[PDB]
């Protein structure tokens, strides 16, 4: 047998314990780590019973080719991926990077959250069923998976966000006459007190609570706002410090044109939330240009249009106490069924780079962390950063690298816009890095005038791999791809 390391991700360069030889006698286990793009290869050998360790001198997303053999008789082979990612300091992780996390299949929360940590995320989103919290009318319980999620988040320094909902027909069988959403006075009260119990129990271990996941069936004004008017005061009395989040990514296209919030504001409902959420899926299109929507306040549904548009709405339609409603991007993602793996990676990095550029949301949550299954032509089984066997996809590498560069730097300047992008980010007025990419699939070359001195610049690609600079008479010659590259200062 060939025993793979359960963790196929490792921070920094160095010795990587990828696998173990479980053979006998003269069976040698050879391993090759081959980097994406340029095929930088690292080799190692392990005899029967020994650990296979390979010296990795550069960062990258690697293909791991394993071969067990006696002399010239190939007994067993294996192929997986291995992500050698940059190490990120705890306090320097992006506070706006989140990821949607379903329960692990192997029930190993520490392993999954170690993998979430090395991707650079500081937030996670997961479900909580009303059904599971209130199994009978008026009687409450906190499910085991909730304690597992929250404690595992605290060990890795992650703020969990919890989406509460789905219909509890067992407790309140008369509560859902028209739709799977509480429309009776009794069931609204039951929902409010059920969430209020959950908020009390967790306290400030969970400061972000999202009311219902994608209530498209529920009308904003006639169905949702009545429920919200009971839930908001019931929950905030129990814990004033939380952010109660409405919408649940409901409305046309998941709400990027304001399909949930605008009806609620026009009906005088602004005070009954601390914020709302959107699910602005643009797949399979780029986050740069997105798609032409039917909801007509905005030219196209993309990050550069949607982010400033919803910022304006929140700025111009304040609460009674003049607090601004926060906008939470509780799901956004692309899948490997309708995009290439490398497109998914490129669009992940571009989402967070463009999100920070037009900074407005305190939490942009990638859907989702792990592939929900193995079926290639099922889109819902291919949104992951990891595969079902915990093997990292290229999007994992892109997340770790983009997290390590972004940190909590604020947007400085647009050097170039349109088909090609060159953007500057930084700290307290000084630029710390530049990012550059092209929307053109085939790639392009551009010449950017050296904004800092050449000896004060390092060029990093999407992967963490360092490249030399090409200087043509005071201009940096950049070979742009869909995958962003980065020019770091000092």
Torsion over CA: 33, 36, 41, 42 (sign)? negative
Q: Rounded distance, CA 303 to CA 258, Å?
A: 14
CB-based contact 332:280 (threshold 8 Å): yes
Counting other chains too, the contacts that 377-386 makes at CB distance below 8 Å and 24 or more residues apart are 377/337, 378/337, 379/335, 379/337, 379/338, 380/335, 381/337, 382/335, 382/336, 382/337, 383/333, 383/334, 383/335, 383/336, 385/99, 385/119, 385/348, 386/115
Are 76 and 68 a contacting pair, CB within 8 Å?
yes
The one-character DSSP state at 424 is: E
Distance CA 375, CA 382 (A): 8
> How was this entry determined?
X-ray
- CA dist 448 and 460 (Å) reads 16
Query: Torsion angle, CA of 100/103/108/110, rounded to 10 degrees?
Result: 30
Structure tokens at 259: 């399909």
Name the residue with tokens 């990638």. Answer: 366
What span, in angstroms and rounded, lies between the C-alpha atoms of 245 and 154? Answer: 21
The answer to whether the beta carbons of residues 99 and 124 sit under 8 Å apart is yes
HSE-CB for 62 with a 13 A CA cutoff: 29
The strand pairing partners of 329, in sequence order, are: 364
Q: Pick the closest to residue 408 from 194, 179, 124, 94 (CA basis).
A: 94
Residues 344 and 131: their CA atoms lie apart, in Å, by: 34
Calculate the CA 427 to chain-centre distance.
23
Tell me whether residue 270 is exposed, middle or buried, using C-beta atoms within 10 angstroms of its C-beta: 0 to 12, 13 to 18, 19 or more.
middle
136 Cβ contact list (under 8 Å, min separation 6): 170, 171
Please state, in angstroms and rounded to a whole number, the distance separating the CA atoms of residues 352 and 287: 10
β-pair type (41-46, 208-211) = unpaired
What's the gap between Cα 349 and its chain centre? 10
Q: Are 82 and 35 in contact (CB under 8 A)?
A: no
Parallel, antiparallel, or unpaired for β 51-56 and 14-21?
A: antiparallel
Q: In Å, what resolution does this model reach?
A: 2.5
Report how far residue 130's alpha carbon sits from residue 133's, in angstroms, rounded to the nearest whole number: 5
Which pair of structure tokens corresponds to residue 194?
């059920």
Q: What share of the chain is helix, strand, coil (3-state, %, to 5)?
A: 25, 30, 45
Q: Sheet holding 41-46: strands in order across?
A: 9-11, 74-85, 60-69, 28-35, 41-46
Q: Strands 364-366 and 97-100: what pairing? A: parallel
C-alpha dist (Å) from residue 102 to 221, 233, 287, 368, 479: 31, 29, 24, 8, 38
Angle (nearest 5°) at CA 114 between 108 and 115: 95
Q: What is the DSSP letter of 257?
A: T
Q: Report the alpha-carbon distance of residue 174 to residue 180 in Å, rounded.
A: 11
* CA–CA distances in Å: residue 80 to residues 18, 34, 66, 241: 10, 11, 8, 45
**Cross-strand pairs, 425:** 411, 433
DSSP string, 330-393: EEE---TTTS-HHHHHHHHHHHHHHHHHT---S-EEES-SB-S-S-TT-GGGS--SB-TTSPBP
* Cβ burial, residue 53 (10 Å; 0-12/13-18/19+): middle
Which residues, at least 6 apart from 127, have a Cβ–Cβ distance to it below 8 Å? 102, 162, 163, 166, 213
> 211, 164 in Cβ contact below 8 A?
yes
Written as six digits, the tokens of 1 are 């047998």
199's CB contacts (< 8 A; 6+ apart) are: 206, 209, 235, 238, 239, 242
The beta-strand segments (E) located in 109-214 are 123-129, 159-165, 208-211
Q: How far apart are CA 371 and CA 352, in angstroms?
A: 20
Do residues 257 and 250 make contact, with C-beta atoms less than 8 angstroms apart? no
Query: How many CA atoms, within 13 angstroms, populate the side-chain half-sphere of residue 392?
Result: 30
* Pair of tokens at residue 486: 């980065």
Which residue is listed with tokens 């780029």?
286
Q: Which helix (H) or strand (E) holds 236?
A: helix 225-238
Distance CA 265, CA 247 (A): 12
Measured CA to CA, the distance from residue 248 to residue 125 in angstroms comes to 12
Name the helix (H) or strand (E) containing 203: none
Between CA 231 and CA 148 the distance in angstroms is 26
Alpha-carbon gap, residue 191 to 164, rounded angstroms: 9
The CA-atom distances, in angstroms, between 15 and each of 40, 56, 361, 399 are: 16, 6, 39, 23
Q: What's the rounded Cα separation, in Å, for the pair 421 and 303?
A: 14
Query: Pick from 226, 217, 221: which is nearest to 178 by CA?
Result: 217
Alpha carbon of 183 to those of 95, 179, 191, 230, 448: distances in Å?
A: 36, 8, 10, 11, 59
Number of Cβ atoms within 10 Å of the Cβ of 6: 12
How many whole angstroms separate alpha carbon 53 and alpha carbon 56? 9
Query: Can you read off the two tokens belonging to residue 466?
Result: 């360092």
Tokens of 323: 């607090």
DSSP one-letter string for 29-49: EEEEEEETTT--EEEEEE-TT
Distance of CA 341 to the CA centre of its chain: 15
Q: What angle do CA 407, 413, 418 make, to 5 degrees?
A: 105
Q: Look up residue 467 and give its two tokens.
A: 């490249």
CA nearest to 328, candidates 437, 210, 197: 210
What's the rounded Cα separation, in Å, for the pair 300 and 293? Answer: 6
Q: List C-alpha distances in Å: 363 to 97, 115, 117, 210, 484.
A: 6, 19, 16, 12, 21
**What does DSSP assign to residue 291?**
B
Which helix (H) or strand (E) segment is 186 a member of? helix 185-202
Task: Report which of 367, 423, 433 is spatially closest to residue 401, judged by C-alpha positions.
Answer: 433
CB-based contact 93:124 (threshold 8 Å): no
Q: How many CB atoms lie within 10 A of CB 72?
A: 5
CB 283, CB 333: distance < 8 Å: yes
**CA–CA–CA angle 95, 98, 102 (5° rounding):** 150
**1, 14 contact by CB (below 8 A):** no
CATH of 90-410, one of 3.20.20.80, 3.50.50.60, 3.30.160.270, 3.30.830.10: 3.20.20.80
- Between the alpha carbon of residue 413 and those of residues 7, 36, 189, 358, 458, the distances in Å are 39, 31, 49, 11, 19
Considering all CA atoms of the chain, what is the largest pairwise distance in Å, rounded to the nearest integer? 78
Start-to-end C-alpha separation, the chain: 47
CA dist., res. 92 & res. 13, Å (int): 20
DSSP state of 419: T
């Amino acid at each position: 047998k060939i025993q793979l390391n359960p963790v196929l991700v490792s921070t920094d360069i160095g010795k990587k314990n990828v696998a173990k030889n479980l053979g006998e006698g003269n069976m040698r286990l050879t391993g090759k780590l081959v980097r994406y793009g340029d095929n930088l290869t690292f080799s190692g050998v392990a005899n029967a019973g020994k650990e296979l360790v390979i010296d990795v001198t550069e960062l990258g997303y690697y293909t791991l080719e394993l071969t067990l053999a006696d002399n010239e008789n190939i007994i067993q082979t294996a192929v997986v991926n291995y992500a050698v990612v940059p190490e990120i300091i705890d306090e320097e992780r992006p506070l706006d990077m989140g990821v949607c996390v379903h329960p692990p299949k192997d029930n190993d929360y520490s392993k999954t959250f170690r993998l979430i940590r090395m991707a650079g995320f500081t937030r996670i989103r997961t479900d909580l069923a009303w059904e599971h919290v209130e199994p009978a009318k008026g009687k409450y319980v906190m499910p085991e998976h909730m304690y597992q999620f929250v404690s595992a988040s605290e060990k890795e320094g992650i703020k969990p966000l919890i989406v509460f909902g789905y219909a509890n027909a067992i407790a309140y069988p008369n509560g859902f006459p028209t739709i799977p959403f509480p429309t009776t006075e009794e069931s609204r009260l039951g929902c409010a007190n059920a969430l209020a119990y959950a908020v009390k129990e967790m306290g400030n271990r969970v400061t972000e609570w999202e009311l219902w996941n994608e209530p498209n069936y529920a009308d904003p004004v006639k169905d949702y706002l009545p429920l919200l008017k009971v839930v908001y005061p019931t929950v905030k009395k129990v814990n004033p410090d939380i952010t109660l989040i409405s919408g649940g990514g409901s409305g046309a296209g998941g709400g990027p044109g304001g399909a949930f919030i605008i009806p609620v504001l026009d009906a005088g409902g602004v005070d009954f939330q601390d914020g709302y959420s959107i699910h602005p899926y643009m797949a399979p299109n780029t986050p740069d240009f997105g798609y032409a929507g039917t909801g007509g306040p905005i030219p196209a549904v993309n990050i550069p249009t949607v982010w400033p548009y919803l910022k304006k709405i929140s700025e111009e339609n304040l609460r009674s106490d003049k607090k601004e409603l926060s906008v939470w991007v509780t799901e956004i993602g692309w899948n490997s069924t309708t995009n290439l793996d490398i497109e998914q990676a490129a669009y992940l990095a571009r989402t967070y780079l463009l999100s920070r550029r037009h900074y407005m949301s305190p939490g942009v949550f990638w859907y989702d962390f792990q592939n929900d299954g193995d079926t290639p032509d099922n889109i819902e089984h291919n949104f992951g950063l990891l595969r079902s066997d915990f093997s990292p996809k290229p999007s994992y590498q892109a997340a770790a690298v983009v997290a390590s560069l972004l940190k909590n730097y604020t947007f400085q300047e647009t050097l170039l816009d349109g088909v090609n992008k060159v953007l500057a980010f930084g700290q307290d007025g000084e630029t710390t890095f530049y990012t550059a990419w092209t929307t053109k699939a085939e790639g392009t070359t551009i010449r950017v005038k050296a904004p800092t001195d050449v000896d004060k610049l390092r060029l990093i690609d999407w992967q963490g791999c360092e490249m030399p600079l090409t200087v043509d008479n005071g201009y940096l010659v950049l070979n742009l791809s869909i995958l962003p590259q980065y020019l770091v200062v000092k």
